[PDB]
Design a protein around this ligand. Sequence first.
Ligand code: MN
Lengths: 241, 244
Amino acid sequence: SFIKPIYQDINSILIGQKVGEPFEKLVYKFLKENLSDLTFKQYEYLNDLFMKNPAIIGHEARYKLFNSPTLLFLLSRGKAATENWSIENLFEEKQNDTADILLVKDQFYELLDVKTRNIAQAPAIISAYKLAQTCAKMIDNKEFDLFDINYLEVDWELNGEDLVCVSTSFAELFKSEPSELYINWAAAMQIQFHVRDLDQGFNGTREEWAKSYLKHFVTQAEQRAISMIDKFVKPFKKYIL
Amino acid sequence: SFIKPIYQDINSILIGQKVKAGEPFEKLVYKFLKENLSDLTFKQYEYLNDLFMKNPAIIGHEARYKLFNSPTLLFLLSRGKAATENWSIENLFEEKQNDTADILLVKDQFYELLDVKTRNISAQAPAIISAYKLAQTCAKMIDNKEFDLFDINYLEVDWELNGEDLVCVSTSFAELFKSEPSELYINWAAAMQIQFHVRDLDQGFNGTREEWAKSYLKHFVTQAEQRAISMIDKFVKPFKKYIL
DNA sequence: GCCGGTCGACGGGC
DNA sequence: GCCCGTCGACCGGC
Ligand SMILES: [Mn+2]
């Protein structure tokens, strides 16, 4: 995390700003103004990577520029989009992209999401399944010291016509207890939580985090299958008889 | 249906119209219907505001819920205790993008819920209704024998890009209750949404609406059982090896 | 709050 | 095209 060591600073600049989505642009702005050389939006990182490798043409070749199957899986775009890419056909911000912001330096990747809220309902974080896949690849490729998925919550309060930042929170996914992670299966299998109160006491490595998270996903997967029978089958059986 | 009879007209008018998202086409259908079927044509929050406004005596969520005279229709169109509780002429409903129906058409205690879909040409099949929402609707239709009360219909607006602007090329009309229920594709991960292309929706179901409900509920259940099972191969089987 | 279902829009494999 | 995940934004019952 390149953000933790300057989170003091980020908090204080964010506290008192006024406009809740417009808030993440102020996080980007600040980070770009202060960590310029390592601050990227995801489509921007991809553009930079590919521009800097003009000889690397076509999807299969460019897929090799990541030299990480986990990072190829989290950060890369699809075969065709990676094929059709050129200096005249650059990538553009897409919501479907994994990270709000990318911070990279000395081969380390900090995937960062900004979450904005008033004072209610837990946002989508990542597909529980997409995470399981991330973990599997981590473990398979022993990529335990490559990336973090961290979060920044901007808490705002209404004010006339303005919205004002009351406070900020920061959390690191790999510092959380995997089993405390709420999975909303129906809602695109999205892990949901508020950054402000995501547990931060996990005392293992990313390897132990990945194993522990796979245990949780597998567990909940089993639990959902069972829950589906109780919720979606049993009650409706009486109408077929 | 109140638009089935006038569809060649909505089709007449829409085809050939330019727009400089694809969504503003929904805007043109609403304008057309509001003008040619003024009293029937709503938008779920309009009807909601309307139903309550013309009943100033009826106050609070329970009393207002009675206004619907239909468990099944309540389910579809209602806004929940607090929203219904704090509704007034100084706190009217506004359209939410997670309401049931884009457009509501109503005459003589009959309801036509109309969704508008818009598209290019070989696009993703869009969300229709939560398979589970529909499962509850059907059950409610049956528990309460409400088989002649509402239809769920769709209008598809096909556009092609023409330089800066989009030009309506064709349109489609289809009825959910005329589709063969067992053909309805349920995308479980994506909010349990049944997805289909309106244009391709088959319309050869011949039976009571009851038979459609019973037949839908057969599909939903079969599909649910299959999904739960498939979670084991999709989400358990591949990750077991990682358990230490 | 916690839980979890709903509508939208889109990617992206084959 | 079909299949079906992934990210947004949201509701609304306890
Ligand atoms: Mn975001």
